[PDB]
Amino acid sequence: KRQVASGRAYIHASYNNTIVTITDPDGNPITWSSGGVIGYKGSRKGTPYAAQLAALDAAKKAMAYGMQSVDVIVRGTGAGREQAIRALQASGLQVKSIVDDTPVPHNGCRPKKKFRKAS
Amino acid sequence: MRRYEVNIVLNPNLDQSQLALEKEIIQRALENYGARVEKVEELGLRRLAYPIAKDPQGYFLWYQVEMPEDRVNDLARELRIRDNVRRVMVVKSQEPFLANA
Amino acid sequence: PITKEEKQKVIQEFARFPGDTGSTEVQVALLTLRINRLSEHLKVHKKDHHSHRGLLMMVGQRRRLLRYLQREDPERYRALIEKLGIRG
Amino acid sequence: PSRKAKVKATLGEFDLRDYRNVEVLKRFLSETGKILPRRRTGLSAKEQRILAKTIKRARILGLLPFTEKLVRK
RNA sequence: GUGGGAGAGGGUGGUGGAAUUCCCGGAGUAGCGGUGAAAUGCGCAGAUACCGGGAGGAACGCCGAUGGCGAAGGCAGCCACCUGGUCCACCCGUGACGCUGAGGCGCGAAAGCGUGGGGAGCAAACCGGAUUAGAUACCCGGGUAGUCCACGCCCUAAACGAUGCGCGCUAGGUCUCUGGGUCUCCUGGGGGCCGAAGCUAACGCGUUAAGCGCGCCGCCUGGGGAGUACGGCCGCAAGGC
Ligand SMILES: [K+]
Ligand SMILES: [K+]
Ligand SMILES: [Mg+2]
Ligand SMILES: [Mg+2]
Ligand SMILES: [Mg+2]
Ligand SMILES: [Mg+2]
Ligand SMILES: [Mg+2]
Ligand SMILES: [Mg+2]
Ligand SMILES: [Mg+2]
Ligand SMILES: [Mg+2]
Ligand SMILES: [Mg+2]
Ligand SMILES: [Mg+2]
Ligand SMILES: [Mg+2]
Ligand SMILES: [Mg+2]
Ligand SMILES: [Mg+2]
Ligand SMILES: [Mg+2]
Ligand SMILES: [Mg+2]
Ligand SMILES: [Mg+2]
Ligand SMILES: [Mg+2]
Ligand SMILES: [Mg+2]
Ligand SMILES: [Mg+2]
Ligand SMILES: [Mg+2]
Ligand SMILES: [Mg+2]
Ligand SMILES: [Mg+2]
Ligand SMILES: [Mg+2]
Ligand SMILES: [Mg+2]
Ligand SMILES: [Mg+2]
Ligand SMILES: [Mg+2]
Ligand SMILES: [Mg+2]
Ligand SMILES: [Mg+2]
């Protein structure tokens, strides 16, 4: 119960899952979705197809709020990052722009051993 | 005594009176710490590349000075005591290094 | 630090004649200058070892020059020590 | 890699030690706030070395960005 | 000596932005996370994803290099102060004042020790999930010491160029960092690569010698036993020599 009609779409994509939030111009979310929000449970959440389904689900739930045009912002590198963006463009939502906001430290914190040989 | 440059970034939302006040305080601290002002440049309000103290702009002051280096750090500390002073950067002066010469 | 008027002052103090820069007396004088300043610097900053090496080197140089002067003309040597007030 | 050319080639005779000059310095940063490598800057060893310093200074002052957001991903 | 230079060389105090964690608030709801696949775990006391604010600690992206500095260990945000070494130009001063260096003294990565702080992230030990014939381990979730600071110890290493320091001599070529110059190029100091002569068992080294020489120091004398035993010295201990 809003009637936003213009907003932001955050695609946060890791290798294990893709979660898509859709928010008002001030960044407060409205609806969100993910691999697990659709049927998938295990590794399949990190699929590009699951990313497509997530983006589309999120966008559908968004257009339920009377959403029309969004600004897409992408965080993270993973399979189905781009596929999430593609699903979003094809969604019927008008995509005004795409941005990579993916956070990186300037040598801040010690990574886990998996992520070592880095800082 | 050595030649320095004092960069000062202030609150753009200051009115005339309070601004004149802050500048007065800067002058007084500068003099009290033994600095002589060779040249001063007031750039005014400028767009920052990122918010400083929540605010997208800043008020720029530039003072080329000479002073007793053993007293330099303190001066900067003094300059930062004020609340309305957002940035202070004191720099050892240098001869201009040109490319395309 | 050591500025130019200071250094020139000590140079013209220990010179053996006008124009003398690098005679043994003047060198021992300059080394005493730098050593004193540096040891004062190391009175605080006890944890700066990289400078302390410098101190060792300067002391070494001074002691070798003095050893030379003692060997050559004992009078100029006694004079130098009495003037600067070193050793002990 | 570096397919246009030489940031240095298009520019006037400028002070590399002026951190207060935004106009000239902004040309040495990429789309993101990252400082351009030598291929792009066209500068020399100590030239580049000085530029890095003055840029970092300008960043501290608030005149130049530390980092930016990439567009059209 | 005078006049210039480059530099993550060292010490003290400041200070900047990104990120992580935690806390407060807003919005939002059914999962998140994690793997080869999973489970533990976390989430309806509302998590994850998004926004704003706050606290705190630690490390400094791009620049960044096949780069620079240091005797070595090692040194990287920015600012100032204090300070070491070094290179060049002038050819000004001293007049062999030199080299090496057993002992001694000091410095000495990481881990470790003592006292007191600090503790975000990481993480020996430990506690769980899995995998496996079994899993102690690899993989996943937690996690204490520790990692950080001060003061005091410890003295080790693939402390590596596996190449002691100094000086003189013996083709060049090519890239590079930093000075000077009559600045296409010559000249000086570093860092690389290909190679003359020569050396080497070979690999390779080759004006940054592993070549030709001189000086001085340290060292080696088949493998295992064994860097063990005994003794001594050092250490709070671990332990070291
Ligand atoms: K050895
Ligand atoms: K030149
Ligand atoms: Mg998954
Ligand atoms: Mg569209
Ligand atoms: Mg303030
Ligand atoms: Mg330094
Ligand atoms: Mg923060
Ligand atoms: Mg909350
Ligand atoms: Mg449960
Ligand atoms: Mg409920
Ligand atoms: Mg805390
Ligand atoms: Mg090393
Ligand atoms: Mg110096
Ligand atoms: Mg002469
Ligand atoms: Mg003579
Ligand atoms: Mg020696
Ligand atoms: Mg002794
Ligand atoms: Mg140690
Ligand atoms: Mg330690
Ligand atoms: Mg301890
Ligand atoms: Mg952990
Ligand atoms: Mg673990
Ligand atoms: Mg060569
Ligand atoms: Mg060379
Ligand atoms: Mg050379
Ligand atoms: Mg041959
Ligand atoms: Mg060769
Ligand atoms: Mg035998
Ligand atoms: Mg042993
Ligand atoms: Mg051993």
Question: Could you tell me which CATH number the domain at B1-101 has?
Answer: 3.30.70.60
Which helix or strand (DSSP H or E) is residue C4 part of? helix C4-14
User: Å from B79 (CA) to E15 (C1')?
Assistant: 13
Q: How far is the CA of A47 from the centre of ligand 3 (A)?
A: 9
In CATH, C1-88 is 1.10.3720.10: no
- Given CB atoms, is B91 within the 8 Å cutoff of chain D? yes
Structural domains in chain A, CATH included, are 1-119 (3.30.420.80)
Alpha helices in D1-73 (DSSP H): 22-25, 38-41, 45-61
Please report, as a single letter, which amino acid is at residue C86: I
Q: Which of residues 20-59 of A touch strand E (CB under 7 A)?
A: 20-21, 23-24, 26-32, 34-37, 41-46
Resolution at which this structure was determined, Å: 3.3
Q: How far is the CA of A110 from the centre of ligand 20 (A)?
A: 21
| Token digits of residue D17 | 């030690």
Distance CA A73, CA A58 (A): 14
φ and ψ at A34, to 5 degrees? Answer: -165, 180
CB-closest option in D12, D14, D20 to B62:
D20
Which among C39, C16, C41 has a CA at the least distance from the CA of C29?
C16
Tally of domains within chain D: 1
| Token digits of residue C39 | 């040891």
Q: Which nucleotide is nearest to D50 (CA to C1')?
A: E63
DSSP code for D9? T
* Sole residue written with tokens 């004191």: B90
**Is C54 (CB) below 7 Å from strand E?**
yes
| Token digits of residue B21 | 């006040």
DSSP code for B99? S
Q: How buried is D56 (Cβ within 10 angstroms: 0-12 exposed, 13-18 middle, 19+ buried)?
A: middle
Beta bridge partners of B60: B9, B44
Q: Please name the chains neighbouring B, where neighbouring means 3+ C-beta pairs under 8 angstroms.
A: D
| Token digits of residue D6 | 């030489």
φ and ψ at D27, to 5 degrees? Answer: -70, -20
Q: Residues 32-51, chain D: which have Cβ within 8 Å of B?
A: 33, 43, 47, 50
- Given CB atoms, is B21 within the 8 Å cutoff of chain D? no
Beta bridge partners of A12: A19, A75
* CB-based contact D72 A97, cutoff 8 Å: yes
Residues of the domain holding D1: 1-73
How far does the CA of residue D24 sit from the closest CA of chain B (Å)? Answer: 12
Q: Are A57 and A39 in contact (CB under 8 A)?
A: no
